[PDB]
């Protein structure tokens, strides 16, 4: 009887949420940016193509130094590039072939990957001999690890296919905080610029905002119709964008706590695999399954260029921290630097 | 300056790194990766036990050809996002408990979703209709009827292209080929030449299963080669 009245009371609470969200919708981002001058057609050319990977390049991450990359492939290799001189700085052989993510530590000392073995493997670059050794295995997740992003040398947040994000302590190797709330597989993260909040789009058409210290879900954002595959914060950390299998990208505002703009074309019926922002946040780059990466005017929803180039779906995308490039991996095994 | 020296050490390190990726390219192209994908009741555990030398990897070789078979055990039941990792595998070994009538539409619907997936519409399936000895006992008992869970079985006769083992009742052969034809009815209704289905009838005590997969992987590679020539 109490369980019967709780679900309808829960439906009562979201009735206030819908009232509160429409109470603050006095305008539209499509209405305020009507008089903004267009960014114009953005011509981008493949500056470098980084070859070396035997199988699908399934993830990728730039360094803070804006020069080195990392790439993970399903062949079980993990290669640190030097996109300036297209050289392979390292090529870490992974224990498990099936790796679904990778990160480069912001200090640049470490690399972490993991995938279908449910573990996150920290790799140390600055070793004694000069090789790369597995610093730690972070075991404790009950599903495939979908995305792990570093905070410091000693903390890492990991997504999982078991509807759970977690914050680890690399020194000790156990989860310090566990984030629970999602209904389906968690597919992506993005840390805040200030590294106090992070979002997580799962396979339940719903992205949540988390407080890393507090360890609890602050706000949940819905608006998508299918699995959310990519997510990134806006460069000021007051907003983020999400891709999905419903072939749309959405801009959310955290303070307004509702959807702000949608990024769809009638010609697009393929899901978004990756999303990223330029340094100013004026562009929204987005990979697709149709092998392209459409470039969006993030304040006018107008497609403003296309990064065609890839023979297979674009797995990963990434704008460099200085903003002077974008890298795009694919299942054709070729990273491509654009500019 | 020593600016040349740093660049000289970089091309030196890339030269060394690149010559392992060539050695690693040889072994990677050599080995055939397989995805073993069944049910808890299917009895995948006994096919792996018949393979002789998070995600359980089993190695075996036949005629000096290496095979790597992955049992993705450790993920949850929702398999629409890790199934995409295996779009490059040589074949999907599907194991079905042919004796378990209640769950066969689960197996058929799973088979249909793999067949018609965007990212698996070029991966051939080596279907293994396991637990044939249990199906034989179930049919001869006459307690549980296939017609209960499949009303199309009322009007079905053993196909002419049939190779029953001696001492098999005509009853057991109808049931065997009806179950198998339900899978082949899905396989023949789409796919349009990119991928094929290889049904086999496997017991728990059967031994020639590594050979069957070696044979069916050879057929998969042959047909891959001779579609680039537009011959098939």
């Amino acid at each position, epitope marked *: 009887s109490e369980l019967d009245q709780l679900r309808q009371e829960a439906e009562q609470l979201k009735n206030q949420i819908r009232d509160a969200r429409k109470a603050c919708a006095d305008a539209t981002l499509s209405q305020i940016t009507n008089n903004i001058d267009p960014v114009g057609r953005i011509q981008m050319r493949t500056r470098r193509t980084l070859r070396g990977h035997l199988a699908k390049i399934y993830a990728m991450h730039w360094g803070t130094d804006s020069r080195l990359l990392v790439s993970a492939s399903q062949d079980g290799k993990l290669i640190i590039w030097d996109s300036y001189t297209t050289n392979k700085v390292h090529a870490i052989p992974l224990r498990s072939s099936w790796v679904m993510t990778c990160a480069y530590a912001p200090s640049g000392n470490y690399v972490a990957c993991g995938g279908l073995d449910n573990i996150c493997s920290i790799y140390n670059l600055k070793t004694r001999e000069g090789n790369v050794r597995v610093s730690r295995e972070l075991a404790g997740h009950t599903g495939y690890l979908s995305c792990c992003r570093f905070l410091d040398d000693n903390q890492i947040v990991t997504s999982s296919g078991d*509807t759970t994000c977690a914050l680890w302590d690399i020194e000790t190797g156990q989860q310090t905080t566990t984030f629970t709330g999602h*209904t*389906g597989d968690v597919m992506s993260l993005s840390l805040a610029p200030d590294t106090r909040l992070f979002v997580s789009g799962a*396979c*339940d*058409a719903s992205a949540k905002l988390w407080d890393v210290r507090e360890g609890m879900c602050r706000q949940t954002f*819905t608006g998508h*119709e*299918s*699995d959310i595959n990519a997510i990134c914060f806006f460069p000021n950390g007051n907003a983020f964008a999400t891709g999905s*299998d*419903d*072939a749309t990208c959405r801009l959310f505002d955290l303070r307004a706590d509702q959807e702000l703009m949608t990024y769809s074309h009638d010609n697009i*019926i393929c*899901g978004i695999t990756s999303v990223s922002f330029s340094k100013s946040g004026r562009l929204l780059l987005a990979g697709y399954d149709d092998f392209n990466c459409n470039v969006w005017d993030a304040l006018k929803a107008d497609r403003a260029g296309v990064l065609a180039g890839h023979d297979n779906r674009v797995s990963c995308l990434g704008v460099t921290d200085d903003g002077m490039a974008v890298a795009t991996g694919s299942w054709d095994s070729f990273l491509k630097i654009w500019n | 300056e020593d600016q040349r020296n740093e660049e000289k050490a970089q091309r030196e390190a890339n030269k060394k790194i690149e010559k392992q990726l060539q050695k690693d390219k040889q072994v990677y192209r050599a080995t055939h990766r397989l995805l073993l994908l069944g049910a808890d009741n299917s009895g995948k555990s006994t096919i792996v036990k018949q393979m002789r030398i998070g995600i359980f990897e089993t190695k075996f070789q036949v005629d000096k050809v290496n095979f790597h078979m992955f049992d993705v055990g450790g993920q*949850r*039941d*929702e*398999r*629409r996002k890790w*199934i995409q990792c295996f779009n490059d595998v040589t074949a999907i070994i599907f194991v079905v408990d042919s004796s378990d009538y209640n769950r066969l*539409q*689960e197996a058929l*619907n799973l088979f*249909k*979703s793999i067949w*018609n*997936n*965007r990212w698996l519409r070029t991966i051939s399936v080596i279907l293994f209709l396991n637990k044939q000895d249990l199906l034989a006992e179930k049919v001869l008992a006459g307690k549980s009827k296939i017609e*209960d*869970y*499949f*009303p*199309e079985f009322a009007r079905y006769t053993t196909p002419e292209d049939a190779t029953p083992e001696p001492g098999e009742d005509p009853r057991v052969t109808r049931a065997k080929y009806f179950i198998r034809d339900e899978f082949l009815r899905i396989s023949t209704a*789409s796919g349009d030449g990119r991928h094929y289905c290889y049904p086999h009838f496997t017991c728990a005590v059967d031994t020639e299963n590594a050979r069957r997969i070696f044979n069916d992987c050879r057929d998969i590679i042959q047909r891959m080669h001779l579609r680039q020539y537009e011959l098939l």
Partner: nanobody
């Protein structure tokens, strides 16, 4: 938000009639294949029937074929399941499930334990 509110179902004598209705909102109902799944007491979820985006690729499970009809109305954004000549075998909770992604001929984990795009369900019970 993706809402699939179910309707119909209740205590029906054997060989009775029923019509289950799920109302869909927060997505374009015409882009997805809609399914019906049920969970018998003491058993796991089982798939009942599906229907393509257009409404021309209907399939049923063996147990209920010719005995149930599934229909959809894209204008109304609703999905129907006509049930007649019921059995004591048919007592279960009927959930209106939606394919995970749009414009696909494949549905991958509609009958899974924790699925996002499924209804809360209606108890259809058949007895005296």
């Amino acid at each position: 938000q993706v809402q699939l509110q179910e309707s119909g179902g209740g205590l029906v004598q054997p060989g009775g009639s029923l019509r289950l209705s799920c109302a869909a909102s927060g997505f374009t109902f015409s882009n997805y294949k809609m399914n019906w799944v049920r969970q018998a007491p003491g058993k796991g979820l089982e798939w009942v029937s599906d229907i393509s985006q257009s409404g021309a690729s209907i399939s049923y499970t063996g147990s209920v074929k010719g005995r149930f009809t599934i229909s959809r109305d894209n204008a109304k954004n609703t999905l129907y399941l006509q049930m007649n000549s019921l059995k004591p075998e048919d007592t279960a909770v009927y959930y209106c499930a939606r394919c995970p992604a749009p414009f696909t001929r494949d549905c991958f984990d509609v009958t899974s334990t924790t699925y996002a795009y499924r209804g809360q369900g209606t108890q259809v019970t058949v007895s005296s």
